[PDB]
Design a binder for this molecule. Sequence first.
Ligand SMILES: [K+]
Ligand SMILES: [Mg+2]
Ligand SMILES: [Mg+2]
Ligand SMILES: [Mg+2]
Ligand SMILES: [Mg+2]
Ligand SMILES: [Mg+2]
Ligand SMILES: [Mg+2]
Ligand SMILES: [Mg+2]
Ligand SMILES: [Mg+2]
Ligand SMILES: [Mg+2]
Ligand SMILES: [Mg+2]
Ligand SMILES: [Mg+2]
Ligand SMILES: [Mg+2]
Ligand SMILES: [Mg+2]
Ligand SMILES: [Mg+2]
Ligand SMILES: [Mg+2]
Ligand SMILES: [Mg+2]
Ligand SMILES: [Mg+2]
Ligand SMILES: [Mg+2]
Ligand SMILES: [Mg+2]
Ligand SMILES: [Mg+2]
Ligand SMILES: [Mg+2]
Ligand SMILES: [Mg+2]
Ligand SMILES: [Mg+2]
Ligand SMILES: [Mg+2]
Ligand SMILES: [Mg+2]
Ligand SMILES: [Mg+2]
Ligand SMILES: [Mg+2]
Ligand SMILES: [Mg+2]
Ligand SMILES: [Mg+2]
Ligand SMILES: [Mg+2]
Ligand SMILES: [Mg+2]
Ligand SMILES: [Zn+2]
Lengths: 176, 231, 37, 122
Amino acid sequence: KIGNRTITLDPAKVNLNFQKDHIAVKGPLGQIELKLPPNLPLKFELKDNNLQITRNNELKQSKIFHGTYNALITNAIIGVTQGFEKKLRLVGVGYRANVEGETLNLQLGYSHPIKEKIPKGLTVKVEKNTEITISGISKELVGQFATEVRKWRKPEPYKGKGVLYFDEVIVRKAGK
Amino acid sequence: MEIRGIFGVKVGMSQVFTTNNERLPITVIYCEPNQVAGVKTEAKDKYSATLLSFDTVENKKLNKPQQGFFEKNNLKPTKHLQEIRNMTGFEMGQQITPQNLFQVGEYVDVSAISKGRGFTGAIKRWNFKIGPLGHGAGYPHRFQGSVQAGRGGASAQRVFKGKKMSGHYGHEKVTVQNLRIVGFDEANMLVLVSGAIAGPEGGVVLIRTAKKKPGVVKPIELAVQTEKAPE
Amino acid sequence: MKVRASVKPICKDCKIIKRHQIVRVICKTQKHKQRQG
Amino acid sequence: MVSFMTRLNVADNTGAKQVGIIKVLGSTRKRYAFLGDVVVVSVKDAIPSGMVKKGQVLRAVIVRTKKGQQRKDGTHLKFDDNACVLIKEDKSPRGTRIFGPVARELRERGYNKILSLAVEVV
RNA sequence: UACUAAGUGGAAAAGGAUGUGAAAGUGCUAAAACAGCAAGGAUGUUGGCUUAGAAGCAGCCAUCGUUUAAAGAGUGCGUAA
RNA sequence: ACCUCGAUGUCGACUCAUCUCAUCCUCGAGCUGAAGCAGGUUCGAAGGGUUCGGCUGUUCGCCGAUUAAAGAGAUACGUGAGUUGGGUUCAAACCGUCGUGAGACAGGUUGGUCCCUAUCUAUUGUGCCCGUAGGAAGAUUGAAGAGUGUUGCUUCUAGUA
RNA sequence: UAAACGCUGAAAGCAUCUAAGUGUGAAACUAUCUCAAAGAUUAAUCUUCCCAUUUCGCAAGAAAGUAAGAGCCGUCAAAGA
Ligand SMILES: [K+]
Ligand SMILES: [Mg+2]
Ligand SMILES: [Mg+2]
Ligand SMILES: [Mg+2]
Ligand SMILES: [Mg+2]
Ligand SMILES: [Mg+2]
Ligand SMILES: [Mg+2]
Ligand SMILES: [Mg+2]
Ligand SMILES: [Mg+2]
Ligand SMILES: [Mg+2]
Ligand SMILES: [Mg+2]
Ligand SMILES: [Mg+2]
Ligand SMILES: [Mg+2]
Ligand SMILES: [Mg+2]
Ligand SMILES: [Mg+2]
Ligand SMILES: [Mg+2]
Ligand SMILES: [Mg+2]
Ligand SMILES: [Mg+2]
Ligand SMILES: [Mg+2]
Ligand SMILES: [Mg+2]
Ligand SMILES: [Mg+2]
Ligand SMILES: [Mg+2]
Ligand SMILES: [Mg+2]
Ligand SMILES: [Mg+2]
Ligand SMILES: [Mg+2]
Ligand SMILES: [Mg+2]
Ligand SMILES: [Mg+2]
Ligand SMILES: [Mg+2]
Ligand SMILES: [Mg+2]
Ligand SMILES: [Mg+2]
Ligand SMILES: [Mg+2]
Ligand SMILES: [Mg+2]
Ligand SMILES: [Zn+2]
């Protein structure tokens, strides 16, 4: 079960301030803020190097929240301590991207130039024109950037053209 | 938005030949210097507008309440008072002319009261079709069109609200948009506006910034005749 | 996606879920997407 | 303004003396055809030594109009008879010569061959 | 005192569904349960007719046996095979 | 066979249209036995648009040429106190057929009277009175609303994917 | 927002667009565009102007006595039966 899963964290640099509805996690990287919805059916306890989430009742939403927020705390700590990264393999005949200031521009196949603004806290690097790496401290934010970059050219099944994900296989078709 | 407005009187229609070889019909508007009679602010009133005074007249042709207001505000007596929404940035008691408002060839829209036509029929009013004239016919030739929606208790049994029938036509405010200013005449205080402006010659006319193309200014220049003295 | 009054798995990999109070079938094969269960 | 079922003359060498309009090509309920417009027609008066036969349905472009049209400068071009020439898919004239004068509206809508084979353009 | 999350109540069938509550049995489990993860996952052989060919995955002749923890003439994909 | 026989005018056409979606075009998307172009099917969507002719009284229908498209229905198979009367169905006359006959035929053909000055309500416009709590002259905000919303071709992008 | 696609995520250690949280998304919807609109009796707001008498008694009382404005009438048409 996720709810009854240990969250053993070292006190070297990661602290977790527990307010009424504002959980703050600070560590090597930037600080992550989590909002607690009101009347949360789960109380945290903060021992030495161990946090344990317990519930009051046997309700369905109680169990659902107990699992979900244990996962959220795990993800916040990991991103604060070591971050998250996503890899996009942009592949094609004339596809290439590069970064200018805060906007990532791409030229896949479109007459109109394609540009994209980078939100705060995320760093996107382009080592090779066919490769994009999105590094951040919040999993959902880097995932939104990866998917919104993908939306311009979804990988087609007939050839390999598109903004593929790394180690992602697509079903091949033979268009004679 | 930043809406600019001026008031004038339409004097007639003419044409001018322009470079790029076009013959442009124009409307001529006599624009008196307008006087800002009041400014109404968004914070103090819940909306923002500018009310000007124009078409100046002598004090003996004005009613007592209006002349009292004019003498209280220290303004020139005028018989016409009207405002435009979202007009800001003008100090009270400042003379405004279209030269400071619009550019040489920018897009503006014009509102004016249409020419009165009186009690007109359905065909002249709603672009309806006339009934057949030959092959046998009946008393109603210029018929409005059957207004039946449903006959019987399970159907409407009534003429629907907002039906298209005969009635009053004309003497109604109408706006024509995206009209390009052609030329300014400072000495005669005379504005040239391309196209046709509604209303009879001598009626009031409101020139406003076009909401469709607020900042668009399409260049236009006139042609200089090359003809010389007879040889 | 195929809209049918009755939805059942076609291959052993098809999995039934309930999303937005509607039961659908999702699977690796896109020819087997069903809805309106 | 040539309209539906309008008899007009042919200003070329093809054997067709009188031609009748069938459709004002270009859109739905296109009421009239002005200078430069393309129409579908049927040959009604022809000659034995002609490339076309009576009754064929063909495509033509109008070059002259009695009503006339007004240009941008303000000049109103007005002929005294409605005339059309028979054209091919490529927009190339079917005849080898064009009789009489033609308008300038052809130049805008391509029809360069028609202008080069005319006597004088107006 | 329980139930419903559908405005069901406040109209409907054949059929479909990890919605939820109650009950009655049965299997394993701190001699470790289930899911997932990490490893192996075999040999004769690719058996043989058969099919251009099939030989772990065409129809067959059927639907083998050992080593071994386990392994199937295979679970599919897939390869002319 | 429940309303109507002290009368509910019945086909088609013209004018004016309104509504529904089981969508013809335009708009968005899933799957494809979807290489591209052009398609097939399903889902969402009713804002607008949805042609002119030949023959027939015709609805229907076949054909011709266009269009992005030439949608399916309902509204007393909408609409004659709005029009027409070609058709059906008065009296006249003939053909085929039936009848011994007078006559008869959802058999065929020629001809043949379509009334009403609007009281109430509904609707399109325009006024008088009064109210808005002193009166009058001006300028406004905008609760509740109405109107419009269609789309094609060419060039470039690019003979690039 | 519909169809559809999501990111992060459990109930159901996997998976999962959804339950919490956070997105994308159509000529449809609400506005942006044009017109009319305080009889909107729920009767709105602002500015300016004119009333602010003498007596008797009875006060949103009397006799006279006090202005802005409007109407009747006439000439008309940017209007109009
Ligand atoms: K009856
Ligand atoms: Mg008569
Ligand atoms: Mg008559
Ligand atoms: Mg009833
Ligand atoms: Mg009714
Ligand atoms: Mg119900
Ligand atoms: Mg079930
Ligand atoms: Mg149950
Ligand atoms: Mg009975
Ligand atoms: Mg009845
Ligand atoms: Mg009666
Ligand atoms: Mg009667
Ligand atoms: Mg009647
Ligand atoms: Mg539908
Ligand atoms: Mg809209
Ligand atoms: Mg004829
Ligand atoms: Mg019926
Ligand atoms: Mg009828
Ligand atoms: Mg009908
Ligand atoms: Mg019937
Ligand atoms: Mg009637
Ligand atoms: Mg009728
Ligand atoms: Mg009549
Ligand atoms: Mg009647
Ligand atoms: Mg008759
Ligand atoms: Mg007759
Ligand atoms: Mg008879
Ligand atoms: Mg006999
Ligand atoms: Mg109302
Ligand atoms: Mg996921
Ligand atoms: Mg949105
Ligand atoms: Mg009362
Ligand atoms: Zn499947």
